[PDB]
Design a protein around this nucleic acid. Structure first.
Lengths: 87, 103, 109, 124, 106, 94, 91, 110
DNA sequence: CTGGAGACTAGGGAGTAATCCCCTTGGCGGTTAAAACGCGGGGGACAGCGCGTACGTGCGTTTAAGCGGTGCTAGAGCTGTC
């Protein structure tokens, strides 16, 4: 009953208005069409580095669930420290 | 006991002598410049602190008072990318199994 | 009339390519919100992490923290990308700008 | 136990065939106050990792020395190795080597013709 | 033969020796900044922070090595900005932008 | 004139400290960066850029020197300062 | 060039060694007058999957014989089992 | 027979037209026996794949030749079926539409 | 080839290190139950490409005057002593 599906690219779930909103949040008047894919591509490489760091913390602690503590520890090294959710 | 000796035995933790031996053990007839010796002397010490910094932080996060091969192997995977991580741990587990196989 | 469109006529001064953007610029700077859908994002983090750990489990704080870090990183890239376009006598951000931004910061290479 | 060799019969470096001062690693861990306890198997793992990093760079430096036709390794050989491979660039992206120089970079406008690099088959 | 009356000198067109200077300088491994002017500059700056100070004759060399690498790497990043703006010249807005995208300018 | 002129510097006090990095010197560093063309205003602007780096590194160095009860700044203080400045240097202190 | 000295990027390129002229000869031998551009990439892909299935069986045969060297007999067993029997090597 | 790549001339209707050299190539390549694809680049492919499958593994000339010869025959046989798929439509160009149909009909991928 | 410091040993009673005894401590795996955010819904303005158009920017070339680097000539900060 534990159905599984071979990994298909669902990163395309990020839509153009979502990228438009992020661009408009950064004060962008017009955004190129190709960047819509690149922004998701940048999201992929940034996420991949984070989880690769994140899973190593969980593997060392033998804990399956992803803790907010473990995420901050990975982010603190890379410099992307996020205040909140940790103590 | 001293009383005539300059007693200039101040020691700075260095790895140049051990680095030089490694060079001869990977290149049979090759030399190293003393100018380049100072570069690698601080390099390995910096790498030691960086790796031990990961191990110390990892132990503190897990509320453990001990560091063993598990923490450092975690640190090696955590810092070293790609083939370097695969080979560094390969040397790492090679060392521990021979250490436990000695008297 | 106000904004007919339909079949089409030569439009007068209307919402020009930057006009609604300023409205969206004002709106997204007037308040703090998340501009990324959570449910597809939750699939995104789980999907990529499946290879590293099978049957990976997340936490409510963890997914939001990762989204916030990812959202801030993309915004931090946009503010650098937008300034690069103006440096190139352009007001539109283009893939040439994004290549330089990550390379100069060392992220690309 | 034993009734012979009541001295330094062998060192901890020779335990795994290593050449680095494993005992110094243990002392440095205690000196730096990394933790109240450091178990066995950590310094021998770290020493092997340090030895591997020392050997790979030195081998590349020796190969770079062969390219420059010099037996001894000048600091220039180190700079070429750390940047040629993406594996070593990540670790030392923000690291400078004394007297190491820089790699012979080139760009599009850095050529006689207008933004074209048709010239090839010689080192680039 | 005479003090005045020599023909047209064999002068390269503007922007030519840059190709020759590029190949020479990347192969070099020495500081391109004179040590003595740099020595006086660091003492003057440190005077405001500390009234009396000395140097080990090696920190001064170390400061020059770091400053040269900091400038050269910035110049390499600055060159990337110039081509991105369709110009060989690196305007002063390039360096200010280059350090803005990086962690500098803060 | 080609000599015997009035613009011959002739002084080292209260001058040349910030202008010791002259036009060829900045060109030399820029050529090591590989660049092809140098703007005329880049030379004066580079002086301000170099100032922020020199001040910050020395700022950590002086505080290190005061902590060690020494009147002399060593390469170790520079290396320790350079570690947190994003520009690490290897080859000194050994 | 001793030691590991291994450089491994996220992508691989030894597949691309088989190039358009190599694919062209097979297409002409099969009578194909013209070949589309993307067939070159697909033909390389077809080669990859076909080889992978063959080696999977052959590897099991090689290790069962405690052999560190592959031989013509081992590849024949994999090929014969899969139905693509080869005559000319071994017997 | 003159080619003259120069500006003069508007070319010719029959200058080894697309497929005519193929009609020459089919006769030449069906008149002799040989290995078509490159040998050494294929040898590296076999070694690289086996290296991931098994860390240490040696090779011999007979083994690699058998793998290459079977692969070439497998590809040639596939091309014959794929070309038969191509003739189904009024076209003479092999396309990814044909290779998907040919493989699915056989035991591969289905 | 003439000094000097470091890297190897020889020994001696404590510390940290593997080993192993017992009660309380955290994630997992199954159930649950009403609020919530997601699928497709159908067209509208509103803005990416791809031509202009209409122009002040950076390149292409030649003088110039100090500006780089080198010989002396005296001192000036930086190595080591107790």
């Amino acid at each position: 009953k534990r159905h599984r599906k071979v990994l298909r690219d669902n990163i395309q779930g990020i839509t153009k208005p979502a990228i438009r909103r992020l661009a408009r949040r950064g004060g962008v008047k017009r955004i190129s069409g190709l960047i819509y894919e690149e922004t998701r591509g940048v999201l992929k490489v940034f996420l991949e580095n984070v989880i690769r760091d994140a899973v190593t913390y969980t593997e060392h602690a033998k804990r399956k669930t992803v803790t907010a503590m473990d995420v901050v520890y990975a982010l603190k090294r890379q410099g992307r420290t996020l205040y909140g959710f940790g103590g | 006991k001293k009383d005539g000796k300059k007693r200039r035995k101040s020691r700075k933790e260095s790895y140049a002598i051990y680095v030089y031996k490694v060079l001869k053990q990977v290149h049979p007839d090759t030399g190293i410049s003393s100018k380049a010796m100072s570069i690698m002397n601080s390099f390995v010490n910096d790498v030691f602190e960086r790796i031990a910094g990961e191990a110390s932080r990892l132990a503190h996060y897990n509320k453990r008072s001990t560091i063993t091969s598990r923490e450092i192997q975690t640190a090696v995977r955590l810092l070293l990318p790609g083939e370097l991580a695969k080979h560094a741990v390969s040397e790492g587990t090679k060392a521990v199994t021979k250490y436990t196989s000695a008297k | 009339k106000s904004a007919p469109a339909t079949g089409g006529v030569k439009k007068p001064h209307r919402y020009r390519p930057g006009t609604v953007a300023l409205r969206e610029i004002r709106r997204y700077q007037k308040s703090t919100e998340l501009l990324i859908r959570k449910l597809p994002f939750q699939r995104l983090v789980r999907e990529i992490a499946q290879d590293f750990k099978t049957d990976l489990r997340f936490q409510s704080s963890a997914v939001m923290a990762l989204q916030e870090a990812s959202e801030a990183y993309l915004v931090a890239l946009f503010e650098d990308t937008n300034l690069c376009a103006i440096h190139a006598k352009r007001v539109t951000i283009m893939p040439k700008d994004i290549q330089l931004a990550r390379r100069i910061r060392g992220e690309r290479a | 136990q034993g009734g012979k060799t009541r001295a330094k019969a062998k060192t901890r470096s020779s335990r795994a065939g290593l050449q680095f001062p494993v005992g110094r690693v243990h002392r440095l861990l205690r000196k730096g106050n990394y933790a109240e306890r450091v178990g066995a198997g950590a310094p021998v793992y770290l020493a092997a990792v340090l030895e591997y990093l020392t050997a790979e760079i030195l081998e590349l430096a020796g190969n770079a020395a062969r390219d420059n036709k010099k037996t001894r390794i000048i600091p220039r050989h180190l700079q070429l190795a750390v940047r040629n491979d993406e594996e070593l660039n990540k670790l030392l992206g923000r690291v400078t080597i004394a007297q190491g120089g820089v790699l012979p970079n080139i760009q599009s406008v850095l050529l006689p013709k207008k933004t074209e690099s048709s010239k090839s088959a010689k080192s680039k």
